[PDB]
DNA sequence: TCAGGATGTATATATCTGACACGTGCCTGGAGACTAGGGAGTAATCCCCTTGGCGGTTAAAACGCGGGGGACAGCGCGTACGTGCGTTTAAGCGGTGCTAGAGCTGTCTACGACCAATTGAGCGGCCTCGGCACCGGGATTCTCGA
DNA sequence: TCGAGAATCCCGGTGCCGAGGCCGCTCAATTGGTCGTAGACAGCTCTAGCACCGCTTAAACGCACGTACGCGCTGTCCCCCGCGTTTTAACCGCCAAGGGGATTACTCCCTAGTCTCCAGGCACGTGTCAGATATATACATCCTGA
């Protein structure tokens, strides 16, 4: 129960942000509420939860605190950020300066947006090499400015015209780049001096490692950083079942939700527009074939059981053999692609059965890849297959990005399969025409889901979305699947704390929170070739069975060598216990 | 009409700009990849600090230096203002290496 | 953890030929290996400039032959002056 | 009975007492001297001060307070027996000195 | 295909020819033939390779797999190269 | 009075390799000689090896390195194989 | 109890016992190994009967029952590594082996 | 009459074919003595120790002649000169 | 006992003896100014090894320059020679 | 293409000579037994290096492209040593004497080595501030052509 | 023989970050008190270095032609230089986890001293054998010549 000893520190605290220019009583201690929305806004009206969480960031200034928006991408964050720059510009008369920090592939949306809704306000951007740039910073050391757009490389290149210059009110974009604690941009932050007030922007809360910590319970908020220092290991002690997680730690839970009330707004899109029908999440199971068979464990074996194996074995050997092309020399000493080549990769086995099924269904699948090598020699035996795809990576430098979409989007367009990395595109890639979503290996963080999962759910896509995730049977990067999806599935509790980050209703924080702590209470029990189950997982309705069967009476009578390619025991052995 | 130099200037001022500086020259990541590659032949894996790397790196620029100013003197002596491949060599294979 | 130099040597001893001119930490790690480096020398070549005569002990003779064999023209006979000096005000005292 | 050290004894800076240390465990001779240590300490003295006068003058030429590797190439190879000394070893940072060969450079 | 890593520019001419020019200006030299660059890569390998190998033979004797600056020191040091600063 | 060589040794090297060829006495001084700085070389490397790794004690491991690093090129491997096979032979007796 | 020299259990011709002594008093280390100067033994087994070897070959190209000291250096140079190793270091009595200029000489 | 170039060529051959030493005795002795006697008066000389310094002398000698001859035949000049003699001690790292 | 003073103790060494020790080293075409810098060459190197050698010689406190001592010279001169000793 | 020219090969003999076999004294290697300390092993903590990717920003690097000059064969001419050749001549050698000092053996101390108390000196952290680095902008300064 | 134009250094203004003091810790220096022992003198041996002294003879030298070649001079192009324009990857920052160097601290185990008797190698002598000066011989090889 340190919230009241919170509640002291906010006491004694609470009058740094103003003096130097019940716990919601401590922001509750200002009595006004204005619902409506500025007049000067023009080009369209304000949604039901934008005037809301307008209300609620502007009732955070009329405490003058530092606020967070959390809630999901789709949702706006654009106009009700600009809304609140015209609105405090035009009621409350503060008027200024503003200083916003955007990423540099979302400068021409910010700053196209900042036009329509905020004619009035003037701006200023930074790109074109330091001729372009200098004219503006001329125009800049004058002090004449009101909302200045900028990127993340620019604080450090433009730390002179920031260091010059004392602001105001500045809204970030981006928080979960800027969250980095020991981040070099981070630092000059700290030593930026500061403006008075800030926000921090983030599409999703805080992920992968232990709880908040380096961006928002340090760097956010003036009191948090002198009382949440030694706090961090208190709070971040749950994350040895039920005792603990469940028993006594569920009331620590409580106040972690209780702190974060005043701060974090976080909502749901299917709470608000709810647009997308529906989705489907499942998963695969693949296993392995003649090199990721024993031979696999036999490398690991005589190599270990260069360095940094398991974490590197997996992400080429256990996705395809010979990404190395030392071996496939053995392998394949002709250099030259032919049949079951590709498909000496137990993974493959599972793609190469979809292909022919989606080539004949006509449907346009979204594939996400790590390490490129599988982009090559998935592009070269893709070529092999003789379908037409598009490719994209980070080499692209956004001219194949801008130009590209515009050949998928196409509907004539033969284009199925579309190449993805899962870093790439800074999710402004915008495409909303692909229903089916296949993966070969999972991501660190739920990056993943929420970026390579959120390419499809966004609106515009009214179709049911499948989802093909692959794994094999008796590996590491199981646990690495486990790991991150069920151990990083502590995230749930922020996942939930949107719902009653929201208006929250009195029940959700207590019954349908308990409803939840069922799916809390199952994680154990999610711990324990098939053509017909493999072929109906991708099948939406019966006139989809009528011609998938008749694919199947179409291979019944042709024979479709063996399933894969197999330890002829020359190559298999041989390869690796010469090289040690 | 444009505006040039006279041959032979340009290296003149080059040469003072350069010899004026202590600057390292060489571009590092460079020869970063280079003696790791040349580095993978003898044992695989190795680890190299960054201030080996910096070490190795401004050795052999130095001891490369001194090789084209040796190569500079042989040349100048064989009456050539320029440099070929023969003195470069004669350079070490008078100094006792090859 | 502990890492021995001798730095504030070569600290006083500029302080004492020119007070107001100082020196970077480049230069002082520079130096540092300078004075092991020569150190190294006269010392490892007297050991063995002891070991010709079969003497066990080396004494003040056997670094200062090894400081006049080591480093060579006029440089030495200064060593040798402030060298000597050192010694004999050394066992005046 | 007060502890004087013998570095000062001998009116010097570098200690006569961490190079006898060092000198001993540096397994040069079985048996150490007594004035030896002195005389390193005294030898190194006149070096140090030598080469760092010459940095200092070559650092007052430039107009720079402190000392670059650079000045203490310049103040090496300078004078002419203390390169004899230094000639077959290299540096790090120094660089250099400017030289243009007579006939190269052109009328 | 284009899969291969064979079709790249390989690591040795990973040394420019503005690099080993500005490098052989500082040397005072003028003119500067073609064959120079080759000549000097081969030369430039060669060192490298052997000072790389008294190295990698200090680094292997003390077990350890990390290549110090004390070590490259040593190598310098010992082929009569020896270079101040550093160690 | 007494001043030892290595001698007899060279000889016998001489009498299991070539046996009818014979040496002559500036032959054996001058191979004598060799050893001898050979032997000076590898040793005297080899303490300095071992005080880089701050080991007090100078081992077969030493001497390893200390050979493999003196003499470059091929000739190494032989005398490695040579060595460790000594090594092993005296340890098994 | 009978007295076997240590260096007939390796199978050597150099003394284990007086490079292991000479080694000690060399002050090389203040501890010396056990198996070091067998080491030692054998590594100068291997030297000197291949260096001697060459010369013998030498000594019999000359139809020489005995070697010379020119025996001795046309069988260092005549080794590419060996004169590596040898290749700084000079030598007495030995001379310089025949070579000519390939222009230099005329048709 | 042979034409010129022949003798040298028969001399060369002549002399790298032979080990003997070369300069002689008895004047380099007055040179070793003579030159001595600037360090320290009244020093003393084992005939070996003359012999040594001799012989020594006498292949680094050779061995600058033959890098001279190098630096010559560089020159496209088959002659000689002080030039390139003092350039292989120049060269070397010497002077 | 006494001492006999002939002149020439620099250039004595004779331009056929010195154009044998040059036709040792393989040269063609001798000019007639490598004598005298060949006896500039001679006698600095003369200076240093003689210099390291007397140096040893009296730090043994010895009147007798002795071949070992030139072996000594010559070894920390960077070229060590062989059969004389050590 | 051919004769007689000034230098190097193989063949008996013989002939000093010094390497090698053989045989003694004697100083040092070696095994056995008994005491102490150097490094290899397990194990937490914190900092730095790997190996696959991303997003940006520029200064350098690459590719042409004209075009200026130096490498680069040739051509003559004047020295410049090369190559004998008589003519001195000083180095090699063998052949004594004379003695300075290198070397060996014997004692006798002044001196490092090792060990026990005692404590200022030098090294890490903390904190602060001039000195070097960077930026227009403007006063020569040598170089490109009339 | 002279005048404009791109480079270079002189200027203040910021600006930021290693260099220097300052405080506190801890551990090698410092100061005695035995105590075993190289090495410093001191004297004796002898032996190898230093004098001529004379004889003998290859070795050097001043000098005479006589071609070899090095240097100056001269056309002829071909290669490198200095711009001028794309283009592109080093350079930062960022991410994802993982593993490799360190510093105390018991715990053994392998080689220092250490006293003892025993055999391997070398300085000194016999007493015999490979090689260099000493002789005479077709051939390997080059110059004049055709
Ligand atoms: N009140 C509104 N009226 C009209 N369009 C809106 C409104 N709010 C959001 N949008 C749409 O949302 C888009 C911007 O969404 P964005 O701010 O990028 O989402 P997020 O906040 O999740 O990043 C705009 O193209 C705009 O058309
Ligand atoms: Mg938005």
Redesign the pocket.
């Known amino acids: 129960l340190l919230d009241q000893t919170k509640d002291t520190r906010i006491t004694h605290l609470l009058r740094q942000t103003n003096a130097f220019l019940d716990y919601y009583n401590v922001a509750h201690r200002i009595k006004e509420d204005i619902k409506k929305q500025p007049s000067i806004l023009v080009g369209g009206t304000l949604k039901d939860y934008q005037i809301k969480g307008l209300q609620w960031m502007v009732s955070l200034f009329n405490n003058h605190l530092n606020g967070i928006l959390a809630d999901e991408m789709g949702l706006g964050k654009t106009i009700q950020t600009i809304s609140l720059l015209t609105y405090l510009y035009e009621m409350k008369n503060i008027r200024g300066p503003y200083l916003v920090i955007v990423?540099?592939?979302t400068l021409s949306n910010w700053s196209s947006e900042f036009a329509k809704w905020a004619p009035t306000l003037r701006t200023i951007s930074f790109?074109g090499?330091?001729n372009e740039?200098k004219a503006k910073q001329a125009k800049i050391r004058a002090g004449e400015f009101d909302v200045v757009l900028t990127?993340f490389?620019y604080i450090?290149?433009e730390?002179?015209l920031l260091?010059?210059v004392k602001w105001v009110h500045m809204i970030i974009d981006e928080g979960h780049?800027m969250?980095?604690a020991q981040?070099?941009?981070?630092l000059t932050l700290n030593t930026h001096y500061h403006a008075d007030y800030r926000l921090i922007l983030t599409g999703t809360p805080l992920?992968?490692?232990l709880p908040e910590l380096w961006a928002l319970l340090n760097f956010v908020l003036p009191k948090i950083f002198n009382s949440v220092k030694s706090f961090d290991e208190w709070f971040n002690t749950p994350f040895d079942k039920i005792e603990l997680s469940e028993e006594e730690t569920l009331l620590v839970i409580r106040r972690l939700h209780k702190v974060l009330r005043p701060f974090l707004l976080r909502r749901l899109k299917k709470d608000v527009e709810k647009e997308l029908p529906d989705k489907v999440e499942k998963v695969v199971k693949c296993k392995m074939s003649a090199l990721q068979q024993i031979m696999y464990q036999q490398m690991l074996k005589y190599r270990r059981l260069?360095?940094?194996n398991?974490?590197?074995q997996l992400k080429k050997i256990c996705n395809h053999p010979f990404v190395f092309e030392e071996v496939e020399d053995q392998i394949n000493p002709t250099r030259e692609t032919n049949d079951d080549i590709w498909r000496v990769a137990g993974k493959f086995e599972l793609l190469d059965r979809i292909l022919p099924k989606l080539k004949a269904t006509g449907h346009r699948v979204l594939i996400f890849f790590?390490?490129?090598?599988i982009m090559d020699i998935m592009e070269d035996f893709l070529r092999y297959i003789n379908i037409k795809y598009l490719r994209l990576?980070?080499?692209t430098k956004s001219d194949e990005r801008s130009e590209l979409l515009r050949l998928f989007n196409a509907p004539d367009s033969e284009y199925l399969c579309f190449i993805l990395?899962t870093?790439?595109?800074?999710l402004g890639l915008n495409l909303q025409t692909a229903d089916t979503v296949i993966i070969f290996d999972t991501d660190?963080?739920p990056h993943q889901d929420l970026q390579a999962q959120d390419r499809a759910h966004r609106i515009g896509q009214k179709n049911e979305v499948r989802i093909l995730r692959l794994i094999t049977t008796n590996s590491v990067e199981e646990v690495i699947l486990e790991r991150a999806y069920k151990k990083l599935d502590i995230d749930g509790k922020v996942i939930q704390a949107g719902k009653f980050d929201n208006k929250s209703t009195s029940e959700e924080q207590e019954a349908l929170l308990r409803s939840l702590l069922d799916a809390e209470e199952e994680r154990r029990k999610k711990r324990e070739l098939k053509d017909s189950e493999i072929n109906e997982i991708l099948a939406r309705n019966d006139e989809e069975m009528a011609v998938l069967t008749r694919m199947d009476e179409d291979r019944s009578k042709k024979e479709e060598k063996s399933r894969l390619l197999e330890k002829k025991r020359e190559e298999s052995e041989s390869a690796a216990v010469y090289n040690g | 009409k444009?505006?040039?130099?006279?041959?032979?200037?340009?290296?003149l001022?080059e040469i003072?700009?350069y010899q004026k500086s202590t600057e390292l020259l060489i571009?590092?990541?460079?020869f970063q990849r280079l003696v790791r590659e040349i580095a993978q032949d003898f044992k695989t894996?190795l680890?190299?600090?960054?201030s080996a790397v910096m070490a190795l790196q401004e050795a052999s620029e130095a001891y490369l230096v001194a090789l084209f100013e040796d190569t500079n003197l042989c040349a100048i002596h064989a009456?050539?203002?320029?440099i070929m491949p023969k003195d470069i060599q004669l350079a070490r294979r008078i100094r006792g290496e090859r | 953890?502990?890492?021995?130099?001798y730095?504030?040597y070569v600290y006083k001893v500029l302080k004492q030929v020119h007070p107001d001119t100082?020196?970077?930490?480049?230069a002082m790690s520079i130096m540092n290996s300078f004075v092991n480096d020569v150190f190294e020398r006269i010392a490892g070549e007297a050991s063995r400039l002891a070991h010709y005569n079969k003497?066990?002990?080396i004494?003040s003779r056997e670094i200062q032959t090894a400081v006049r064999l080591l480093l060579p023209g006029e440089l030495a006979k200064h060593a040798v002056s402030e060298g000597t000096k050192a010694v004999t005000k050394y066992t005046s005292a | 009975?007060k502890?004087?050290?013998?570095?000062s004894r001998a009116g010097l800076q570098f200690?006569?007492?961490?190079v006898h240390?060092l000198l001993?465990k540096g397994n040069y001779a079985e048996?150490?001297?007594?004035g030896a240590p002195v005389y390193l300490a005294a030898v190194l003295e006149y070096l140090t001060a030598e080469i760092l006068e010459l940095a200092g003058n070559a650092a007052r030429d430039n107009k720079?307070?402190?000392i670059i590797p650079r000045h203490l190439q310049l103040a090496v190879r300078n004078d002419e027996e203390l390169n004899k000394l230094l000639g077959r070893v290299t540096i790090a940072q120094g660089g250099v000195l400017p030289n243009i060969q007579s006939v190269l450079l052109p009328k | 295909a284009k899969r291969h890593r064979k079709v790249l520019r390989d690591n040795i001419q990973?040394i420019?020819?503005?690099?080993i020019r500005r490098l052989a200006r500082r040397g005072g030299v003028?003119?500067?033939?073609?064959l120079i660059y080759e000549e000097t890569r081969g030369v430039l390998k060669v060192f490298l390779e052997n000072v790389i190998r008294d190295a990698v033979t200090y680094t292997e004797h003390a077990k350890?797999?990390?290549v110090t600056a004390m070590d490259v020191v040593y190598a310098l040091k010992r082929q009569g190269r020896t270079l101040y600063g550093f160690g």
């Open positions: 990423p540099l592939s790109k090499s330091p740039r990127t490389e450090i290149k730390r002179a260091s010059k780049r969250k980095n981040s070099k941009l981070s992920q992968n490692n260069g360095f940094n398991q974490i590197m790590q390490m490129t090598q990576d980070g080499h990395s870093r790439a595109g800074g660190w963080n | 444009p505006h040039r130099y006279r041959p032979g200037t340009v290296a001022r003072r700009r571009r590092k990541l460079p894996d680890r190299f600090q960054s009456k050539r203002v320029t | 953890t502990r890492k021995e130099s730095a504030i100082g020196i970077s930490s480049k003497r066990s002990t004494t | 009975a502890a004087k050290t013998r570095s200690p006569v007492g961490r240390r001993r048996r150490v001297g007594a720079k307070t402190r | 990973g420019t020819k503005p690099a003028k003119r500067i033939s073609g350890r797999k990390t």
